[PDB]
Amino acid sequence: ETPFAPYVLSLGINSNGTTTYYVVTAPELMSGTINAVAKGIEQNGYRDYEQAGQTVFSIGGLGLTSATGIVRDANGYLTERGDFVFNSSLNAFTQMDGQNMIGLELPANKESGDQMTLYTVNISDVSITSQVKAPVFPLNQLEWPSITGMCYSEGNVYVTYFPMNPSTFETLYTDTTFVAVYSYPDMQFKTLMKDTRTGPAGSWNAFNGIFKVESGDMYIMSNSAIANGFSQSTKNAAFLRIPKGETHFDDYYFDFETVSGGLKPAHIKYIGNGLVFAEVSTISPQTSADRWGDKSLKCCIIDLNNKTVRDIKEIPVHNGDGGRRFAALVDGGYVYRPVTASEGTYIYQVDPQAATAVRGAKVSTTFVGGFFRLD
Numbered sequence: 001e002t003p004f005a006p007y008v009l010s011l012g013i014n015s016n017g018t019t020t021y022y023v024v025t026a027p028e029l030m031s032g033t034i035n036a037v038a039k040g041i042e043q044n045g046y047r048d049y050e051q052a053g054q055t056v057f058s059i060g061g062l063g064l065t066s067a068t069g070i071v072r073d074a075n076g077y078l079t080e081r082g083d084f085v086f087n088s089s090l091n092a093f094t095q096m097d098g099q100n101m102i103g104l105e106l107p108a109n110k111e112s113g114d115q116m117t118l119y120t121v122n123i124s125d126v127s128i129t130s131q132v133k134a135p136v137f138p139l140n141q142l143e144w145p146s147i148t149g150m151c152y153s154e155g156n157v158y159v160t161y162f163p164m165n166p167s168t169f170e171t172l173y174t175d176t177t178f179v180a181v182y183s184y185p186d187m188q189f190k191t192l193m194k195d196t197r198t199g200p201a202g203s204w205n206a207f208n209g210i211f212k213v214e215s216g217d218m219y220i221m222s223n224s225a226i227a228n229g230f231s232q233s234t235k236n237a238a239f240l241r242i243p244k245g246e247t248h249f250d251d252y253y254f255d256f257e258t259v260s261g262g263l264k265p266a267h268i269k270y271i272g273n274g275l276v277f278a279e280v281s282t283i284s285p286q287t288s289a290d291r292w293g294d295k296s297l298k299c300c301i302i303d304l305n306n307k308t309v310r311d312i313k314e315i316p317v318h319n320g321d322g323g324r325r326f327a328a329l330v331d332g333g334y335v336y337r338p339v340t341a342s343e344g345t346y347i348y349q350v351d352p353q354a355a356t357a358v359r360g361a362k363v364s365t366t367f368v369g370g371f372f373r374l375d
Protein backbone atom coordinates (compact mmCIF):
# COMPACT_ATOMS: atom_id res chain seq x y z
CA GLU A 1 0.00 0.00 0.00
CA THR A 2 1.44 3.34 -1.11
CA PRO A 3 1.04 6.10 1.50
CA PHE A 4 -0.47 9.42 0.42
CA ALA A 5 -1.22 8.00 -3.02
CA PRO A 6 -3.58 10.45 -4.77
CA TYR A 7 -5.57 8.27 -7.18
CA VAL A 8 -8.43 6.08 -5.96
CA LEU A 9 -9.62 3.12 -8.05
CA SER A 10 -12.50 0.83 -7.11
CA LEU A 11 -11.52 -2.48 -8.72
CA GLY A 12 -14.61 -4.63 -9.19
CA ILE A 13 -13.30 -8.19 -9.46
CA ASN A 14 -15.71 -11.05 -10.15
CA SER A 15 -15.09 -14.35 -8.38
CA ASN A 16 -17.34 -17.40 -7.95
CA GLY A 17 -19.96 -15.57 -10.01
CA THR A 18 -20.22 -12.62 -7.60
CA THR A 19 -18.48 -9.25 -7.77
CA THR A 20 -16.33 -7.99 -4.88
CA TYR A 21 -14.99 -4.43 -4.87
CA TYR A 22 -11.49 -3.47 -3.72
CA VAL A 23 -10.99 0.25 -3.09
CA VAL A 24 -7.26 0.73 -3.73
CA THR A 25 -4.85 3.63 -4.07
CA ALA A 26 -2.52 4.44 -6.96
CA PRO A 27 0.34 6.97 -7.17
CA GLU A 28 0.58 6.90 -10.98
CA LEU A 29 -1.69 6.45 -14.00
CA MET A 30 0.96 5.87 -16.70
CA SER A 31 3.27 3.01 -15.66
CA GLY A 32 3.13 0.18 -13.16
CA THR A 33 0.20 -2.19 -12.77
CA ILE A 34 -2.69 -1.24 -10.49
CA ASN A 35 -3.54 -4.38 -8.51
CA ALA A 36 -5.37 -5.24 -5.29
CA VAL A 37 -2.95 -7.79 -3.81
CA ALA A 38 -2.11 -6.93 -0.17
CA LYS A 39 -3.56 -3.44 -0.82
CA GLY A 40 -7.00 -1.87 -0.73
CA ILE A 41 -10.13 -2.27 1.39
CA GLU A 42 -12.70 -4.97 0.62
CA GLN A 43 -16.41 -4.35 0.05
CA ASN A 44 -19.08 -6.97 -0.66
CA GLY A 45 -22.45 -6.71 -2.34
CA TYR A 46 -23.18 -4.23 -5.12
CA ARG A 47 -21.54 -0.84 -4.59
CA ASP A 48 -21.49 2.29 -6.75
CA TYR A 49 -19.12 5.14 -5.95
CA GLU A 50 -19.70 8.91 -6.00
CA GLN A 51 -17.23 11.54 -4.79
CA ALA A 52 -17.69 15.01 -3.32
CA GLY A 53 -15.32 17.19 -1.36
CA GLN A 54 -12.77 14.73 0.02
CA THR A 55 -15.28 11.91 0.60
CA VAL A 56 -16.17 8.94 -1.61
CA PHE A 57 -19.63 7.53 -0.93
CA SER A 58 -19.95 3.80 -1.61
CA ILE A 59 -23.72 3.49 -2.03
CA GLY A 60 -25.07 -0.04 -1.93
CA GLY A 61 -27.60 -1.55 -4.26
CA LEU A 62 -29.40 -4.74 -5.21
CA GLY A 63 -30.60 -5.06 -1.64
CA LEU A 64 -27.78 -3.10 -0.02
CA THR A 65 -29.40 -0.02 1.54
CA SER A 66 -26.41 1.70 3.14
CA ALA A 67 -23.92 4.35 2.03
CA THR A 68 -20.41 4.13 3.50
CA GLY A 69 -17.95 7.03 3.57
CA ILE A 70 -14.37 6.56 2.37
CA VAL A 71 -11.91 9.34 3.22
CA ARG A 72 -8.15 9.78 3.43
CA ASP A 73 -6.72 8.94 6.84
CA ALA A 74 -4.19 11.14 8.62
CA ASN A 75 -1.61 8.48 7.69
CA GLY A 76 -2.29 9.01 3.97
CA TYR A 77 -4.26 5.76 3.64
CA LEU A 78 -7.90 5.27 2.69
CA THR A 79 -10.29 4.54 5.55
CA GLU A 80 -14.02 4.00 5.99
CA ARG A 81 -15.55 6.86 8.01
CA GLY A 82 -19.28 7.36 8.52
CA ASP A 83 -22.31 5.58 7.09
CA PHE A 84 -25.98 6.40 6.58
CA VAL A 85 -28.91 4.08 5.93
CA PHE A 86 -32.02 4.08 3.75
CA ASN A 87 -34.72 1.52 2.97
CA SER A 88 -34.97 1.06 -0.82
CA SER A 89 -32.34 2.61 -3.11
CA LEU A 90 -30.64 5.91 -3.93
CA ASN A 91 -32.23 6.58 -7.32
CA ALA A 92 -30.29 9.85 -7.60
CA PHE A 93 -27.48 11.45 -5.62
CA THR A 94 -25.50 14.66 -6.20
CA GLN A 95 -24.30 17.65 -4.18
CA MET A 96 -25.99 21.04 -3.85
CA ASP A 97 -23.39 22.96 -1.83
CA GLY A 98 -19.89 22.33 -0.49
CA GLN A 99 -21.19 20.52 2.60
CA ASN A 100 -24.43 18.69 1.76
CA MET A 101 -25.45 15.92 -0.62
CA ILE A 102 -28.96 15.71 -2.07
CA GLY A 103 -30.45 12.29 -2.70
CA LEU A 104 -33.71 11.12 -4.26
CA GLU A 105 -35.20 7.72 -3.41
CA LEU A 106 -38.19 6.20 -5.29
CA PRO A 107 -40.17 3.07 -4.41
CA ALA A 108 -39.62 -0.03 -6.51
CA ASN A 109 -43.13 0.21 -7.98
CA LYS A 110 -46.55 1.72 -7.29
CA GLU A 111 -47.61 -1.04 -4.87
CA SER A 112 -44.36 -0.51 -2.95
CA GLY A 113 -45.59 2.96 -1.94
CA ASP A 114 -46.52 6.35 -3.36
CA GLN A 115 -43.96 8.44 -1.44
CA MET A 116 -40.46 9.41 -2.56
CA THR A 117 -37.86 10.64 -0.07
CA LEU A 118 -35.25 13.39 -0.44
CA TYR A 119 -32.28 13.10 1.92
CA THR A 120 -29.91 15.96 2.71
CA VAL A 121 -26.77 14.26 4.04
CA ASN A 122 -23.71 15.93 5.51
CA ILE A 123 -20.57 15.33 3.45
CA SER A 124 -18.18 15.58 6.41
CA ASP A 125 -20.32 13.55 8.83
CA VAL A 126 -21.76 11.04 6.32
CA SER A 127 -25.14 11.17 8.05
CA ILE A 128 -28.68 12.24 7.16
CA THR A 129 -29.11 15.78 8.50
CA SER A 130 -32.50 16.30 6.86
CA GLN A 131 -35.14 14.32 5.01
CA VAL A 132 -38.50 15.16 3.44
CA LYS A 133 -40.85 13.03 1.36
CA ALA A 134 -43.21 13.98 -1.45
CA PRO A 135 -45.78 12.37 -3.76
CA VAL A 136 -44.64 10.51 -6.86
CA PHE A 137 -47.69 11.43 -8.96
CA PRO A 138 -46.18 13.82 -11.55
CA LEU A 139 -43.61 11.13 -12.37
CA ASN A 140 -45.84 8.10 -13.03
CA GLN A 141 -48.44 10.10 -14.99
CA LEU A 142 -47.39 8.10 -18.07
CA GLU A 143 -45.60 5.16 -16.41
CA TRP A 144 -43.64 4.43 -13.25
CA PRO A 145 -40.49 6.57 -13.49
CA SER A 146 -36.88 5.49 -13.71
CA ILE A 147 -34.46 8.24 -12.68
CA THR A 148 -31.47 9.13 -14.86
CA GLY A 149 -29.99 12.00 -12.85
CA MET A 150 -30.69 14.94 -10.57
CA CYS A 151 -28.97 18.23 -9.77
CA TYR A 152 -29.51 21.46 -7.85
CA SER A 153 -29.80 24.98 -9.26
CA GLU A 154 -30.93 28.17 -7.49
CA GLY A 155 -33.16 26.55 -4.89
CA ASN A 156 -34.69 24.04 -7.31
CA VAL A 157 -34.20 20.27 -7.54
CA TYR A 158 -34.29 19.05 -11.15
CA VAL A 159 -34.98 15.35 -11.74
CA THR A 160 -34.61 13.73 -15.17
CA TYR A 161 -36.28 10.38 -15.74
CA PHE A 162 -38.08 8.22 -18.25
CA PRO A 163 -41.30 6.20 -17.89
CA MET A 164 -40.59 2.47 -17.78
CA ASN A 165 -42.92 -0.46 -17.09
CA PRO A 166 -41.27 -1.68 -13.87
CA SER A 167 -42.22 -5.32 -14.58
CA THR A 168 -41.50 -5.74 -18.31
CA PHE A 169 -38.99 -2.86 -18.62
CA GLU A 170 -40.92 -1.45 -21.58
CA THR A 171 -40.47 2.22 -22.51
CA LEU A 172 -43.38 3.29 -24.73
CA TYR A 173 -43.08 7.08 -24.34
CA THR A 174 -39.74 7.86 -26.00
CA ASP A 175 -40.65 11.00 -27.99
CA THR A 176 -40.85 13.54 -25.15
CA THR A 177 -38.09 14.77 -22.84
CA PHE A 178 -39.38 14.86 -19.26
CA VAL A 179 -37.81 16.59 -16.27
CA ALA A 180 -39.59 17.51 -13.03
CA VAL A 181 -38.68 20.51 -10.86
CA TYR A 182 -39.22 20.76 -7.11
CA SER A 183 -38.79 23.45 -4.48
CA TYR A 184 -35.77 22.32 -2.49
CA PRO A 185 -36.63 22.48 1.23
CA ASP A 186 -40.30 21.48 0.84
CA MET A 187 -39.73 19.04 -2.05
CA GLN A 188 -42.95 20.46 -3.51
CA PHE A 189 -43.69 19.74 -7.16
CA LYS A 190 -43.52 22.89 -9.31
CA THR A 191 -43.60 21.97 -13.01
CA LEU A 192 -42.92 19.10 -15.39
CA MET A 193 -40.78 20.44 -18.22
CA LYS A 194 -41.68 18.47 -21.34
CA ASP A 195 -39.90 19.02 -24.65
CA THR A 196 -40.94 17.46 -27.96
CA ARG A 197 -37.60 17.99 -29.74
CA THR A 198 -36.01 14.70 -28.61
CA GLY A 199 -36.78 11.72 -26.39
CA PRO A 200 -36.34 11.23 -22.65
CA ALA A 201 -33.20 12.52 -20.95
CA GLY A 202 -30.77 9.81 -19.84
CA SER A 203 -30.51 6.04 -19.59
CA TRP A 204 -31.44 3.37 -17.06
CA ASN A 205 -29.32 3.62 -13.89
CA ALA A 206 -26.70 5.48 -15.95
CA PHE A 207 -26.88 8.84 -14.10
CA ASN A 208 -26.29 10.56 -17.46
CA GLY A 209 -29.52 12.56 -17.50
CA ILE A 210 -28.42 16.06 -16.49
CA PHE A 211 -25.26 17.95 -15.56
CA LYS A 212 -24.60 21.63 -14.84
CA VAL A 213 -21.60 23.61 -16.06
CA GLU A 214 -19.51 26.54 -14.82
CA SER A 215 -22.12 29.14 -15.81
CA GLY A 216 -24.75 27.45 -13.63
CA ASP A 217 -26.79 26.45 -16.69
CA MET A 218 -27.66 22.77 -16.98
CA TYR A 219 -27.50 20.40 -19.94
CA ILE A 220 -29.48 17.22 -20.50
CA MET A 221 -28.69 14.37 -22.88
CA SER A 222 -31.35 12.32 -24.66
CA ASN A 223 -30.28 9.15 -26.40
CA SER A 224 -33.23 6.71 -26.53
CA ALA A 225 -30.46 4.14 -26.85
CA ILE A 226 -31.85 0.61 -26.99
CA ALA A 227 -28.35 -0.69 -26.22
CA ASN A 228 -28.56 1.18 -22.89
CA GLY A 229 -31.90 -0.20 -21.72
CA PHE A 230 -34.67 1.27 -23.87
CA SER A 231 -37.27 -0.76 -25.75
CA GLN A 232 -37.56 1.67 -28.67
CA SER A 233 -36.18 4.87 -30.16
CA THR A 234 -38.48 7.42 -31.81
CA LYS A 235 -36.54 10.70 -31.65
CA ASN A 236 -32.89 11.54 -32.25
CA ALA A 237 -30.17 11.64 -29.62
CA ALA A 238 -29.26 15.21 -28.73
CA PHE A 239 -28.44 17.69 -25.97
CA LEU A 240 -30.78 20.32 -24.54
CA ARG A 241 -30.10 23.24 -22.21
CA ILE A 242 -32.06 24.56 -19.23
CA PRO A 243 -30.80 28.01 -18.13
CA LYS A 244 -29.51 28.79 -14.65
CA GLY A 245 -32.37 28.66 -12.16
CA GLU A 246 -35.13 28.45 -14.78
CA THR A 247 -37.98 26.06 -15.60
CA HIS A 248 -38.09 26.27 -19.40
CA PHE A 249 -35.86 24.94 -22.17
CA ASP A 250 -34.06 27.58 -24.22
CA ASP A 251 -33.57 27.60 -28.00
CA TYR A 252 -30.42 25.46 -27.70
CA TYR A 253 -30.42 22.25 -29.74
CA PHE A 254 -27.44 19.95 -30.41
CA ASP A 255 -28.61 17.08 -32.64
CA PHE A 256 -25.92 14.56 -31.70
CA GLU A 257 -27.30 11.53 -33.55
CA THR A 258 -27.20 13.20 -36.97
CA VAL A 259 -23.93 15.10 -36.46
CA SER A 260 -22.28 11.84 -35.34
CA GLY A 261 -23.46 9.55 -38.14
CA GLY A 262 -26.31 7.61 -36.57
CA LEU A 263 -24.55 6.97 -33.24
CA LYS A 264 -26.10 7.42 -29.81
CA PRO A 265 -23.97 8.29 -26.76
CA ALA A 266 -23.87 5.80 -23.90
CA HIS A 267 -21.98 7.72 -21.20
CA ILE A 268 -20.99 11.36 -20.70
CA LYS A 269 -18.76 13.26 -18.28
CA TYR A 270 -18.49 17.05 -18.40
CA ILE A 271 -14.81 18.01 -18.29
CA GLY A 272 -15.19 21.79 -18.49
CA ASN A 273 -15.61 24.71 -20.90
CA GLY A 274 -18.19 23.08 -23.15
CA LEU A 275 -16.17 19.85 -23.50
CA VAL A 276 -17.58 16.43 -22.58
CA PHE A 277 -15.77 13.10 -22.53
CA ALA A 278 -18.24 10.62 -24.01
CA GLU A 279 -18.53 6.93 -24.76
CA VAL A 280 -20.82 6.51 -27.78
CA SER A 281 -22.22 3.30 -29.26
CA THR A 282 -20.72 2.36 -32.63
CA ILE A 283 -23.83 0.26 -33.37
CA SER A 284 -25.81 2.28 -35.90
CA PRO A 285 -28.92 0.04 -36.09
CA GLN A 286 -29.66 -0.33 -32.37
CA THR A 287 -31.74 -3.52 -32.41
CA SER A 288 -33.44 -5.25 -29.50
CA ALA A 289 -30.68 -7.88 -29.64
CA ASP A 290 -28.25 -5.13 -28.57
CA ARG A 291 -30.45 -4.16 -25.61
CA TRP A 292 -28.85 -3.86 -22.16
CA GLY A 293 -25.56 -4.60 -23.91
CA ASP A 294 -23.73 -1.27 -24.12
CA LYS A 295 -21.18 -2.96 -26.40
CA SER A 296 -18.73 -1.57 -28.95
CA LEU A 297 -18.18 1.87 -27.43
CA LYS A 298 -15.96 4.60 -28.85
CA CYS A 299 -14.45 7.48 -26.89
CA CYS A 300 -15.15 10.97 -28.18
CA ILE A 301 -14.82 14.64 -27.27
CA ILE A 302 -18.12 16.54 -27.47
CA ASP A 303 -17.89 20.30 -27.98
CA LEU A 304 -21.23 21.73 -26.87
CA ASN A 305 -20.44 25.30 -27.92
CA ASN A 306 -19.28 24.47 -31.45
CA LYS A 307 -21.55 21.37 -31.46
CA THR A 308 -18.96 18.86 -32.67
CA VAL A 309 -18.06 15.25 -31.91
CA ARG A 310 -14.45 14.17 -32.44
CA ASP A 311 -13.35 10.54 -32.27
CA ILE A 312 -10.48 9.58 -29.96
CA LYS A 313 -8.79 7.22 -32.42
CA GLU A 314 -6.15 6.01 -29.94
CA ILE A 315 -8.75 4.29 -27.71
CA PRO A 316 -9.93 0.94 -29.13
CA VAL A 317 -13.57 -0.02 -29.56
CA HIS A 318 -14.64 -1.61 -26.27
CA ASN A 319 -17.69 -2.64 -24.28
CA GLY A 320 -18.96 -0.29 -21.60
CA ASP A 321 -19.74 -0.83 -17.92
CA GLY A 322 -23.50 -0.90 -18.57
CA GLY A 323 -26.04 1.10 -16.62
CA ARG A 324 -23.78 2.49 -13.90
CA ARG A 325 -21.89 5.63 -12.91
CA PHE A 326 -19.38 6.59 -15.60
CA ALA A 327 -15.85 5.89 -14.31
CA ALA A 328 -13.72 8.75 -15.62
CA LEU A 329 -11.36 11.14 -13.83
CA VAL A 330 -10.94 14.77 -14.92
CA ASP A 331 -7.49 15.62 -13.57
CA GLY A 332 -4.80 18.08 -14.62
CA GLY A 333 -6.55 19.03 -17.85
CA TYR A 334 -6.77 15.39 -18.95
CA VAL A 335 -9.48 12.73 -18.84
CA TYR A 336 -8.48 9.30 -17.54
CA ARG A 337 -10.69 6.38 -18.56
CA PRO A 338 -10.17 2.64 -17.89
CA VAL A 339 -10.76 0.80 -21.18
CA THR A 340 -11.14 -2.99 -21.25
CA ALA A 341 -9.40 -4.00 -24.48
CA SER A 342 -8.64 -7.46 -25.87
CA GLU A 343 -5.22 -7.72 -24.21
CA GLY A 344 -6.45 -6.31 -20.92
CA THR A 345 -7.79 -3.27 -19.10
CA TYR A 346 -5.65 -0.13 -19.42
CA ILE A 347 -5.97 3.43 -18.13
CA TYR A 348 -6.07 5.78 -21.12
CA GLN A 349 -5.17 9.46 -20.77
CA VAL A 350 -7.19 11.73 -23.06
CA ASP A 351 -6.10 15.18 -24.22
CA PRO A 352 -9.41 16.94 -24.93
CA GLN A 353 -8.08 19.75 -27.14
CA ALA A 354 -6.30 17.32 -29.47
CA ALA A 355 -8.88 14.57 -28.80
CA THR A 356 -5.92 12.21 -28.48
CA ALA A 357 -5.12 9.36 -26.12
CA VAL A 358 -2.07 7.68 -24.59
CA ARG A 359 -2.26 4.25 -23.00
CA GLY A 360 -1.19 4.41 -19.37
CA ALA A 361 -1.14 1.98 -16.47
CA LYS A 362 -2.56 -1.52 -16.82
CA VAL A 363 -5.14 -2.35 -14.14
CA SER A 364 -5.69 -5.90 -12.87
CA THR A 365 -9.47 -6.12 -12.46
CA THR A 366 -12.66 -7.06 -14.26
CA PHE A 367 -13.89 -3.45 -14.31
CA VAL A 368 -13.73 -0.19 -12.37
CA GLY A 369 -16.58 1.16 -10.27
CA GLY A 370 -15.03 4.46 -9.24
CA PHE A 371 -12.10 6.60 -10.40
CA PHE A 372 -11.39 9.52 -8.07
CA ARG A 373 -8.58 11.66 -6.66
CA LEU A 374 -7.98 12.93 -3.12
CA ASP A 375 -5.61 15.52 -1.67
Ligand SMILES: [Fe+3]
Binding pocket: none
Ligand atom coordinates in the same frame (compact mmCIF):
# COMPACT_ATOMS: atom_id res chain seq x y z
FE1 LIG B 1 -30.25 -5.42 -12.54
